[PDB]
């Protein structure tokens, strides 16, 4: 067939940043039909597969839940959590870093009013949080970031009060991806166009490594195809959900004795998954049983399927759920 | 035969489900099914989904 | 008199503007309309219920 | 027998003491789901004979 | 309010009475989201008597 | 990679059924949910026109 370098490798010549926020670089050496075909495979690489980090659990010190109504606050305990949603913070390399704001007088909240960690980057400092309108109205939240992959409901998340009012969450950092034709502008022939991304990331991820990683993605999506050393299996998954109710069964189906139906049920044992969770080396202890009593539970459960130094699942059963 | 009584509310936060209509101030009556995800949903130039 | 005034604004001036497919790839015969149309979710009866 | 509401119920659980804390009353917004309870109460059956 | 009007839309909200409408002029004390007390300059300033 | 940013799994050829000289089988199980538009779309405008052969 041949296969000997017949078309251009792409290769960096010039990237623009006319932001820091938005830049525009592009490719020179793509042939008429390259510049679709790539463009097309990444469109759809970007729009969720893209981890990035936001504002998920916050406690407020002072409201209880999102219904009651901080005093010395303009807006209602509502309207003043939905700006977390667009307080975007990057994280060097950890998953939970909890953040403290604290401040008091009139003037709306910043981001720079936050601690300031070494890990943690503000991208936006002048970032309202709350508007306070009272002077002796104080303000404090434990603003905590994570990392999951885009967006998070707070329907799907949320006794005492611990985490309480929780917010939602948008991880994913660009929200746009577009694509333009444009013919290069080469030195050796005329048949040659560019790719030409334009991205609009938060402020997380730098475009620049952002689109690599990107085409990266595809890369690791045909490396089967460049005949690699890659011996690993795809999905070897035996799904078919079953249980053992039997279990949930009492200790009065194993036909005992008065003693041991005494003696069981002193020690807090009143289904048989509560006894084969023990061991029965730590049972000859307790001044009120033996080997004997042992043996022969052990003889029954040989019927049932069931033997001493067993795990157990969706136990315990139907109980008092607080 | 009642000592006292206690009144209890029950706000729901009912959230955007498909079942529901939708319809405007001409009549474009409508019924939201499926929900179309972002990958698959073309844009415009600059890049902006529908 | 809309006509007139539909010259400015960005670039279009018919409202058909070029849409890129996000499936396929391939741009879409003949460009669609785009534009912003008021709306309304009218409340969900509990009358169809499960 | 006349029953009352208080938040000290001789009851075998503590799902129910969990909420009600606010002598008889409990606080206000939380989360769980369905099938749980509100108010405390305690009514006698049987003439407190088994 | 939608893009476009007739200029009918706030003789309806006026003449409903849903939004509150001052009778007396004056400064504006407190402005809590759910509280709202406007003191009058009829009687000689006193934290107790206005 | 090393410092754990895939957190995907990545499909890979196993299995050719040749039941011709000319004509196969090229499957590919490990997919998601939009990977199946982008490869069929990727690899469609090359077998298609990017193709040496003879004739």
Same mark, same amino acid.
Not at chain 1, 72 to 83: A, C, S, T
Not at chain 1, 90 to 110: A, F, W
Not at chain 1, 222 to 249: G, H, M, N, S, T
């Given at each position: 067939?041949?296969?000997?370098?017949?078309?251009?490798?792409?290769?960096?010549?010039?990237?623009?940043?006319?932001?820091?926020?938005?830049?525009?670089?592009?490719?020179?050496?793509?042939?008429?039909?390259?510049?679709?075909?790539?463009?097309?495979?990444?469109?759809?690489?970007?729009?969720?597969?893209?981890?990035?980090?936001?504002?998920?659990?916050?406690?407020?010190?002072?409201?209880?839940?999102?219904?009651?109504?901080?005093?010395?606050?303009?807006?209602?305990?509502?309207?003043?959590?939905?700006?977390?949603?667009?307080?975007?913070?990057?994280?060097?390399?950890?998953?939970?870093?909890?953040?403290?704001?604290?401040?008091?007088?009139?003037?709306?909240?910043?981001?720079?009013?936050?601690?300031?960690?070494?890990?943690?980057?503000?991208?936006?400092?002048?970032?309202?949080?709350?508007?306070?309108?009272?002077?002796?109205?104080?303000?404090?939240?434990?603003?905590?970031?994570?990392?999951?992959?885009?967006?998070?409901?707070?329907?799907?998340?949320?006794?005492?009060?611990?985490?309480?009012?929780?917010?939602?969450?948008?991880?994913?950092?660009?929200?746009?991806?577009?694509?333009?034709?444009?013919?290069?502008?080469?030195?050796?022939?005329?048949?040659?166009?560019?790719?030409?991304?334009?991205?609009?990331?938060?402020?997380?991820?730098?475009?620049?490594?952002?689109?690599?990683?990107?085409?990266?993605?595809?890369?690791?999506?045909?490396?089967?195809?460049?005949?690699?050393?890659?011996?690993?299996?795809?999905?070897?998954?035996?799904?078919?959900?079953?249980?053992?109710?039997?279990?949930?069964?009492?200790?009065?189906?194993?036909?005992?004795?008065?003693?041991?139906?005494?003696?069981?049920?002193?020690?807090?044992?009143?289904?048989?998954?509560?006894?084969?969770?023990?061991?029965?080396?730590?049972?000859?202890?307790?001044?009120?049983?033996?080997?004997?009593?042992?043996?022969?539970?052990?003889?029954?459960?040989?019927?049932?399927?069931?033997?001493?130094?067993?795990?157990?699942?969706?136990?315990?059963?139907?109980?008092?759920?607080? | 035969?009642?000592?006292?009584?206690?009144?209890?509310?029950?706000?729901?936060?009912?959230?955007?489900?498909?079942?529901?209509?939708?319809?405007?101030?001409?009549?474009?009556?409508?019924?939201?099914?499926?929900?179309?995800?972002?990958?698959?949903?073309?844009?415009?130039?600059?890049?902006?989904?529908? | 008199?809309?006509?007139?005034?539909?010259?400015?604004?960005?670039?279009?001036?018919?409202?058909?503007?070029?849409?890129?497919?996000?499936?396929?790839?391939?741009?879409?015969?003949?460009?669609?309309?785009?534009?912003?149309?008021?709306?309304?979710?009218?409340?969900?009866?509990?009358?169809?219920?499960? | 027998?006349?029953?009352?509401?208080?938040?000290?119920?001789?009851?075998?659980?503590?799902?129910?003491?969990?909420?009600?804390?606010?002598?008889?009353?409990?606080?206000?917004?939380?989360?769980?789901?369905?099938?749980?309870?509100?108010?405390?109460?305690?009514?006698?059956?049987?003439?407190?004979?088994? | 309010?939608?893009?476009?009007?007739?200029?009918?839309?706030? =003789? &309806? %909200?006026?003449?409903? @009475? $849903?939004? =509150? &409408? %001052?009778?007396?002029? @004056? $400064?504006?004390?407190?402005?809590?989201?759910?509280?709202?007390?406007?003191?009058?300059?009829?009687?000689?300033?006193?934290?107790?008597?206005? | 990679?090393?410092?754990?940013?895939?957190?995907?799994?990545?499909?890979?050829?196993?299995?050719?059924?040749?039941?011709?000289?000319?004509?196969?089988?090229?499957?590919?199980?490990?997919?998601?949910?939009?990977?199946?538009?982008?490869?069929?779309?990727?690899?469609?405008?090359?077998?298609?026109?990017?193709?040496?052969?003879?004739?």
């Amino acid at each position: 067939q041949g296969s000997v370098t017949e078309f251009l490798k792409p290769r960096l010549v010039d990237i623009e940043q006319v932001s820091s926020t938005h830049a525009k670089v592009t490719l020179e050496p793509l042939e008429r039909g390259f510049g679709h075909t790539l463009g097309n495979a990444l469109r759809r690489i970007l729009l969720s597969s893209m981890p990035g980090c936001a504002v998920t659990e916050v406690e407020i010190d002072g409201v209880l839940h999102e219904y009651s109504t901080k005093e010395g606050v303009q807006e209602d305990i509502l309207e003043i959590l939905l700006n977390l949603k667009g307080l975007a913070v990057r994280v060097q390399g950890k998953d939970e870093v909890i953040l403290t704001l604290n401040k008091s007088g009139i003037g709306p909240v910043t981001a720079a009013d936050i601690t300031h960690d070494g890990d943690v980057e503000i991208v936006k400092p002048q970032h309202v949080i709350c508007h306070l309108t009272d002077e002796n109205a104080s303000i404090s939240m434990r603003i905590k970031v994570q990392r999951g992959r885009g967006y998070v409901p707070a329907s799907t998340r949320i006794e005492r009060p611990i985490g309480r009012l929780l917010v939602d969450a948008c991880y994913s950092p660009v929200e746009r991806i577009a694509y333009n034709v444009e013919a290069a502008r080469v030195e050796q022939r005329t048949d040659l166009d560019k790719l030409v991304i334009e991205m609009e990331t938060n402020g997380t991820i730098d475009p620049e490594e952002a689109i690599r990683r990107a085409a990266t993605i595809l890369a690791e999506q045909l490396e089967a195809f460049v005949d690699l050393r890659d011996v690993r299996q795809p999905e070897v998954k035996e799904e078919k959900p079953e249980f053992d109710p039997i279990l949930l069964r009492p200790v009065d189906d194993l036909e005992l004795t008065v003693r041991s139906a005494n003696c069981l049920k002193a020690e807090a044992i009143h289904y048989i998954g509560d006894l084969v969770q023990r061991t029965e080396v730590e049972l000859l202890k307790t001044p009120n049983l033996g080997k004997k009593s042992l043996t022969e539970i052990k003889d029954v459960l040989a019927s049932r399927g069931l033997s001493l130094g067993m795990r157990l699942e969706n136990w315990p059963p139907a109980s008092i759920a607080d | 035969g009642v000592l006292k009584i206690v009144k209890v509310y029950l706000a729901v936060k009912r959230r955007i489900q498909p079942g529901d209509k939708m319809a405007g101030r001409h009549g474009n009556k409508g019924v939201i099914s499926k929900i179309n995800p972002i990958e698959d949903m073309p844009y415009d130039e600059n890049g902006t989904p529908v | 008199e809309i006509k007139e005034l539909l010259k400015l604004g960005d670039l279009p001036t018919s409202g058909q503007i070029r849409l890129y497919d996000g499936r396929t790839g391939e741009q879409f015969e003949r460009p669609v309309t785009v534009g912003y149309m008021y709306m309304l979710k009218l409340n969900h009866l509990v009358d169809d219920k499960m | 027998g006349p029953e009352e509401i208080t938040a000290d119920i001789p009851n075998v659980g503590e799902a129910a003491l969990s909420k009600l804390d606010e002598s008889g009353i409990v606080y206000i917004g939380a989360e769980v789901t369905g099938g749980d309870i509100l108010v405390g109460k305690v009514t006698p059956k049987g003439e407190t004979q088994l | 309010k939608p893009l476009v009007g007739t200029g009918m839309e706030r =003789a &309806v %909200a006026v003449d409903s @009475g $849903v939004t =509150a &409408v %001052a009778k007396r002029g @004056g $400064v504006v004390q407190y402005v809590d989201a759910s509280r709202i007390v406007i003191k009058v300059n009829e009687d000689e300033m006193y934290p107790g008597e206005a | 990679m090393q410092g754990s940013v895939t957190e995907f799994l990545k499909p890979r050829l196993v299995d050719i059924e040749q039941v011709s000289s000319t004509h196969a089988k090229v499957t590919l199980e490990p997919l998601e949910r939009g990977f199946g538009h982008t490869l069929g779309n990727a690899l469609r405008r090359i077998l298609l026109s990017s193709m040496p052969g003879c004739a």
